[PDB]
Amino acid sequence: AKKILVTCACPYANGSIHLGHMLEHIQADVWVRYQRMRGHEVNFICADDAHGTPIMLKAQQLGITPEQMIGEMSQEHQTDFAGFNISYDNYHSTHSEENRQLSELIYSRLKENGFIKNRTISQLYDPEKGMFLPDRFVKGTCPKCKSPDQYGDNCEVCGATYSPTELIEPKSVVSGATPVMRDSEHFFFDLPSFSEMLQAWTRSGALQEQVANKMQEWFESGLQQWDISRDAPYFGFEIPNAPGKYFYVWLDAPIGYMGSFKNLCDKRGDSVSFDEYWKKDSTAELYHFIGKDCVYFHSLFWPAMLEGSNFRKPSNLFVHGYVTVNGAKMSKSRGTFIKASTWLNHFDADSLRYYYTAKLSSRIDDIDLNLEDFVQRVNADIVNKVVNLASRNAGFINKRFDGVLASELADPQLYKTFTDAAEVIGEAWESREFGKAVREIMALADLANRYVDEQAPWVVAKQEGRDADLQAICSMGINLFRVLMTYLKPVLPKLTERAEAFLNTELTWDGIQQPLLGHKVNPFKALYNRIDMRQVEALVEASK
Numbered sequence: 001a002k003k004i005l006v007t008c009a010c011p012y013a014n015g016s017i018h019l020g021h022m023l024e025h026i027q028a029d030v031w032v033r034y035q036r037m038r039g040h041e042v043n044f045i046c047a048d049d050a051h052g053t054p055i056m057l058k059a060q061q062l063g064i065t066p067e068q069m070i071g072e073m074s075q076e077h078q079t080d081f082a083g084f085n086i087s088y089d090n091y092h093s094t095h096s097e098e099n100r101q102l103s104e105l106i107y108s109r110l111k112e113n114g115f116i117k118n119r120t121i122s123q124l125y126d127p128e129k130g131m132f133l134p135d136r137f138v139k140g141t142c143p144k145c146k147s148p149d150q151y152g153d154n155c156e157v158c159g160a161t162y163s164p165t166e167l168i169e170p171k172s173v174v175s176g177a178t179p180v181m182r183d184s185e186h187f188f189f190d191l192p193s194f195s196e197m198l199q200a201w202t203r204s205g206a207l208q209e210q211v212a213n214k215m216q217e218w219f220e221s222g223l224q225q226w227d228i229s230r231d232a233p234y235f236g237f238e239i240p241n242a243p244g245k246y247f248y249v250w251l252d253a254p255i256g257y258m259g260s261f262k263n264l265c266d267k268r269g270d271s272v273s274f275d276e277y278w279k280k281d282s283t284a285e286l287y288h289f290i291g292k293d294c295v296y297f298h299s300l301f302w303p304a305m306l307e308g309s310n311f312r313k314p315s316n317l318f319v320h321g322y323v324t325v326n327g328a329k330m331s332k333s334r335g336t337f338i339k340a341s342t343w344l345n346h347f348d349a350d351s352l353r354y355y356y357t358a359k360l361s362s363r364i365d366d367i368d369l370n371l372e373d374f375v376q377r378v379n380a381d382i383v384n385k386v387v388n389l390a391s392r393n394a395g396f397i398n399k400r401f402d403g404v405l406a407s408e409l410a411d412p413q414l415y416k417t418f419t420d421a422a423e424v425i426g427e428a429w430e431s432r433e434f435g436k437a438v439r440e441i442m443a444l445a446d447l448a449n450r451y452v453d454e455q456a457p458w459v460v461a462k463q464e465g466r467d468a469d470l471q472a473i474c475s476m477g478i479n480l481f482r483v484l485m486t487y488l489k490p491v492l493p494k495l496t497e498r499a500e501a502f503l504n505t506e507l508t509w510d511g512i513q514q515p516l517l518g519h520k521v522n523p524f525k526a527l528y529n530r531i532d533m534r535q536v537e538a539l540v541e542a543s544k
């Protein structure tokens with residue numbers, strides 16, 4: 001009955017999708033697929049984050065327009081996400097007419113409401129290229145240790161940190177010219193004006209405990225005004241009435257959430273839903289799946305912007321931790337910085353979806369992809385527990401009973417144990433306690449395989465006159481498989497499709513209350529094959 005708008009953070013348009021991205025998009029997709037299974041109206045929304053100085057400069061280096069460049073990466077991103085079956089209702093771009101009009105609207109409202117301040121700043125400027133330089137486009141000699149060729153505000157030899165104005169003999173990364181300090185008028189969003197409102201939200205108990213605790217540190221330090229403007233040359237949206245000024249990516253990037261939803265509504269011919277979801281009186285729910293590095297932005301700056309422009313605010317933020325590989329930050333030299341596209345050359349999407357889901361919880365803890373454990377857990381849980389219930393039983397049904405399952409359950413008590421678990425498993429999906437859900441599902445899978453072991457179909461099959469017993473045992477196992485695959489349907493979309501083809505039925509959450517009786521199933525080849533460490537070694541080598 002609910003109306004739900006769910007987002008993932010907008011991926012940066014000048015980088016390939018990697019396993020870190022995939023943790024976020026898989027987490028959101030599992031939750032979204034479960035919400036759809038319970039009958040709610042869900043809109044799963046994302047976009048590419050396509051503006052800014054680095055993108056402008058990279059396009060110039062490539063000799064193409066920024067529009068061509070961001071279009072190519074957007075296609076690359078959506079191909080990768082589609083390969084992992086991330087079920088977006090719309091994937092748009094921050095570089096769109098919808099986002100331009102919404103950015104201009106929100107800015108004009110913030111300005112009229114008194115939340116935009118004008119302030120002159122001083123910044124390093126490349127007089128040959130003719131542009132202000134972000135910190136990382138200034139290089140020079142460390143003022144402390146005198147090591148040359150250091151970038152930005154820190155030295156990678158001695159570890160010192162400093163303003164780039166302290167670099168000795170500074171050079172523009174763009175042109176090699178010596179930069180100089182230049183003044184420019186910038187426009188600032190008066191975030192401090194919203195501190196009391198934001199502190200109330202922090203205390204409300206909606207946010208994760210770990211996020212609320214961190215926000216208290218930020219309030220203690222003191223909220224600051226945030227620069228929302230950039231000087232030309234720039235790739236982005238020009239500020240009305242302010243020639244030569246552009247909106248900084250901070251402003252237009254989250255508005256891209258709104259622009260993507262407006263684009264979806266407009267493409268559908270739906271003239272009511274945008275206001276239904278974004279007006280202040282909305283009864284729809286708005287959720288953002290984000291990582292730790294995006295929490296300050298989504299928990300303070302973004303709700304303040306929405307409040308100041310008369311829009312509704314997020315219902316909640318769902319924050320996940322970083323991905324590690326073999327216990328450590330991804331390492332290019334070790335081959336553990338793994339692109340999504342590369343992953344799919346070696347493994348399927350379901351394997352990573354399952355492994356992440358088994359490790360995820362409602363907390364912000366980092367998620368470790370241990371590659372040895374990945375092989376063991378996928379083979380143990382998917383091949384040998386869940387799929388085993390189908391593969392060990394289907395052959396007898398197809399070959400000796402014409403594909404027809406028994407007309408009654410052999411063990412109705414055991415079946416009720418499986419269906420009785422739906423409430424706790426569903427609540428685990430709902431609360432984002434994914435690891436809890438998987439633990440209960442695999443505990444049931446162990447029960448199901450213990451049942452089959454106890455009945456010993458490999459013995460019954462050879463014994464004269466026991467055809468009825470064999471059909472009963474094998475049909476019971478297949479009905480337990482039906483239930484487990486329903487509980488796993490949000491996690492494993494492609495295996496589920498193969499399971500539905502075998503079972504000759506769509507898997508619905510409520511359907512488990514009616515077992516398959518006197519029901520024809522189809523043959524299948526192999527629902528899910530084993531993986532091995534040679535494949536992991538090939539993935540690592542291909543990523544170096």
Ligand SMILES: CSCC[C@H](N)CC(=O)O
Pocket residue numbers: 008009010011012049253254294
């Ligand atoms: C509106 S969400 C914007 C997210 C930024 N692109 C940061 C990131 O993708 O890591």
Ligand SMILES: [Zn+2]
Pocket residue numbers: 142143144145146147155156157158159160
């Ligand atoms: Zn140094």
